[PDB]
Structure 1
Amino acid sequence: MAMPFEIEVLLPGELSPAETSALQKCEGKIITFSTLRHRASLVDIALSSYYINGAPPDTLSLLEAYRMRFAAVITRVIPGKLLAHAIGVGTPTPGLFIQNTSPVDLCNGDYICLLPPVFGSADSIRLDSVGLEIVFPLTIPQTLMREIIAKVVARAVERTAAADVICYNGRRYELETNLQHRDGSDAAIRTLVLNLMFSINEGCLLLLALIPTLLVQGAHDGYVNLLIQTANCVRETGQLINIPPMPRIQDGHRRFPIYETISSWISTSSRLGDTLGTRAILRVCVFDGPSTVHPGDRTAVIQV
């Protein structure tokens, strides 16, 4: 293997010229595959493959599909077949390109993540001669997707127990997530709580008596004032909770607690969002094209 992993998706001979032109209008969009063959079938990139328990899925289920699968990029469509290049399996992939399907811009250098279509109506192409819907995952920068994943997992936790607007570059895009059932919800919440537990450790006690120092610094400095007031917890405890003199740590002359309570948080934090969501597989690296990228322009990329 020295070339990129090419993929030969076939079109039935019974597709309308209208749908073929529609496909011509989508070269450079991203699809996925259940398994990674070399002679794929059109059925395996349609919504008939995103079925859990025989029904179109929700935003949580699709969010699991998008990382339980493999990705590819539609380079060019022809009457004979459909071509696509695998992304994160076979390293060599030159001059690749993507189409920005998102209501935001694409700054040079940022990393790209892919979502299920949530903002408004999807750009779904309905192939009627075969009866297949084709929806293309989004193209969202990494620093932004985290806000969306947090604001959707909050709604999930809330629906299970008992805001939909996000601002980015001074623009308000409403979140229209849905969860028509309940098991993906707690399937997510269990990971949330699990990773929430393994953060606290021995040195958290020392880190707790440092809250009043953070308060007096919040009085002393300025950016600390921006940081303290979004924390819906610290602003209460240091004013309504106290921690007495901590007892001495068992074998305090050999081990060191803070090292652990801060090293076991770097690990558990990086992998957090890539579990409630997806990782970033591509990063926009325009060499000589425009500076930024508007919604719907062809880009240039290298895989992560």
Structure 2
Amino acid sequence: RTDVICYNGRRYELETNLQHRDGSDAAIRTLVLNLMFSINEGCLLLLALIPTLLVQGAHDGYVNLLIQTANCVRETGQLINIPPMPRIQDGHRRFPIYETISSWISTSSRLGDTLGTRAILRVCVFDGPSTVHPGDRTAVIQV
């Protein structure tokens, strides 16, 4: 600013409603925080490996599952620096891959905690099937 869902032949309708900007500031703050926490030093190395990646994937078969949705990723791949192989300050106890994967894990955990509602409700069915049906009565089981 600044629908139809199909599942097993069933269509679900929704009605959106957005007329206030009280949460727009929070949304932009959290998205900019996620963007700032997501950038790392491995992106340059990943972008500097597109020819090798496409060569490896030419005889792999797992290409359509990414190119059916990566309509702009391929276009933006050639619009980057593509630097040559850099030189690390030390080659004994340096590993940016570990740092970037740790940062990604931390950010994923943070976003899962922020977007995850705490609800300790794990029921356990007995005898009958676990699937519930509209119009039946069940019990409460605490785990």
TM-score (norm. length: structure 2):
0.71
CA shift in 2, pair 1:264/1:254, >3 Å: same
Instruction: Check the 8 A contact 1:203/1:257 in 2, yes or no.
Output: yes
SS of alignment partner, residue 212 of structure 1:
helix
User: 1:238 and 1:176, CA in 2 relative to 1: closer, same or farther beyond 3 A?
Assistant: same
Q: What is the match of residue 278 of structure 1?
A: 117
Question: Does the C-alpha gap of structure 1 residues 257 and 167 become closer, same or farther in structure 2, counting only changes over 3 Å?
Answer: farther
1:183 offset after TM fit, Å?
1.8
Choose between structure 1 and 2 for higher RCO, CA contacts under 8 A separated by at least 6 residues. 1
Q: Does the 8 Å contact 1:218/1:228 carry over to 2? A: no
**Larger proportion of strand:** 1
Shift of 1:297: 4.7
Summarize deviations over 1:208-233 as a string: whole Å, max 9, x none. 22333443444333333212332344
The reply on whether 1:204 has 2:43 as its aligned counterpart is yes
- 1:128-168 deviation per Cα after TM superposition (whole angstroms, max 9, x unaligned): xxxxxxxxxxxxxxxxxxxxxxxxxxxxxxxxxxx923344
Whole-angstrom CA distance in 2 between matches of 1:173 and 1:303: 32
Cα distance, 1:184 vs structure 2:
1.0
Query: Does the Cα contact within 8 Å between 2:47 and 2:80 map onto a contact in 1?
Result: no
The whole-number CA distance in structure 1 between the counterparts of 2:123 and 2:50 is 41
Q: Give yes or no for contact 1:165–1:173 (8 Å, CA) kept in 2.
A: yes
Give the 3 Å change call, closer, same or farther, for CA 249–192 of structure 1 in structure 2.
same
What whole-Å deviation, never above 9, does each CA across 1:19-41 have from its counterpart, x for those lacking one? xxxxxxxxxxxxxxxxxxxxxxx
Separation of aligned partners in 1, 2:91 and 2:108: 27
**In the superposition, relative to structure 1, how do residues 264 and 299 fare at CA in structure 2: closer, same or farther (>3 Å)?**
farther
* Secondary structure of the corresponding residue to residue 141 of structure 2: strand
Check conservation: 1:229, 1:235, Cα contact below 8 A: no
Equivalent positions of 1:254-265 (< 5 A) are: 254-265=93-104
CA spacing shift, 1:239–1:203, aligned 2, 3 Å: closer
TM-fit CA distance, 1:236: 1.9
Q: How many residues align?
A: 142
Give the match's secondary structure for 1:221: coil
- Cα distance change, pair 223–174 in 1 and its aligned pair in 2 (3 A): farther
Residue 164 of structure 1 aligns with which residue? 3
Report the CA distance between 1:292 and its aligned residue. 2.2
1:65-88 alpha-carbon deviations (Å, 9 max, x no partner): xxxxxxxxxxxxxxxxxxxxxxxx
Query: 1 CA distance for matches of 2:110 and 2:132?
Result: 29
Q: Matched residue of 2:68: which SS?
A: helix
Equivalent pair of 1:202/1:261 in contact (CA under 8 Å): yes
Task: Note if contact 1:208-1:243 (Cα within 8 Å) is conserved in structure 2.
Answer: yes
Structure 1 residue 295: deviation in Å?
A: 4.8
Structure 2 unpaired stretches of 5+: none
C-alpha displacement of 1:299: 5.5
Q: CA RMSD in A?
A: 3.4
How much does 1:265 deviate? 0.6
Label 1:224 to 1:300 Cα distance change in 2 as closer, same or farther (>3 A): farther
Please show how residues 1-304 of structure 1 align to structure 2 within 5 Å.
164-276=3-115, 278-279=117-118, 281-283=120-122, 285-295=124-134, 297-298=136-137
Identity over aligned pairs, percent: 99
TM-score under structure 1 length normalisation:
0.39
CA distance in 1, matches of 2:61, 2:140: 39
- C-alpha spacing 1:264/1:234, structure 2 compared with 1 (3 Å): same
